[PDB]
Amino acid sequence: IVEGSDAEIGMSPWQVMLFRKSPQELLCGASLISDRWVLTAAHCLLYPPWDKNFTENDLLVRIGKHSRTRYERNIEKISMLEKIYIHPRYNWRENLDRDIALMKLKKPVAFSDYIHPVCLPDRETAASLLQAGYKGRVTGWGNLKEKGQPSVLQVVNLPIVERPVCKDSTRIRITDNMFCAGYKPDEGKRGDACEGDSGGPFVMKSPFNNRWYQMGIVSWGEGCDRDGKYGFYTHVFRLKKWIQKVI
């Protein structure tokens, strides 16, 4: 995350780190939606033109983290995936359309102060909050630009941008399963997701029940925090039937 801040302890208890077994290494972000499932971007597990195609075992899921590096001895939990499900119609060929994936953790993920699931939106919740101008929050241990990579979870709030502005910011074909966010050129401020933040949740707090909902998944961008450019996110609510289904 660019132009963010260090997260507070227990601010994002659903935040999950996708960790490379060997070479050990941070893959992407993710989110806990149940006590056995994890949400993330399909392209964190499957990107052929770059020969990326991780299996259930080349992987490890780390929950309740704060420090990007350290093994947080009695607060973090590690698990192994029992299976991965990529959206059958994920388009890594055209523009990262339907960039989604679940991970039936193989062993339960007992919760605690730093481990708690985020809510998945309902048609009405999505309806009232997914509006240009409404701010959302993205977290990740991503790049601090285009100490380049942080030491503790980063966080930043970004307004939703109207589809037309989003479309004429790029030459890639935007679909209905995406939405973009960030401040405008003139707005007089920045911030953005960046490399390493992918698969990370984009959340909003519902002013009606005072609950946090995952509206999107960090998918792609064009550079990091450049003027006239925006971050693209998977539209979680439009892909919800697919989610219920594999669950």
């Binding site: 507070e8 699931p117 929050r137 707090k205 002013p207 005072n210």
Partner: peptide, 29 residues
């Protein structure tokens, strides 16, 4: 009991920026 943070909502504590969050939906100042 999803979306309710044990260290913030469950104890009635607000994080230092969820405030700049709630203010966007209604439009502050």
């Amino acid at each position: 009991d999803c979306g309710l943070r044990p260290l913030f909502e469950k104890k009635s504590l607000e994080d230092k920026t969820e405030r700049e969050l709630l203010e966007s939906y209604i439009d502050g100042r």
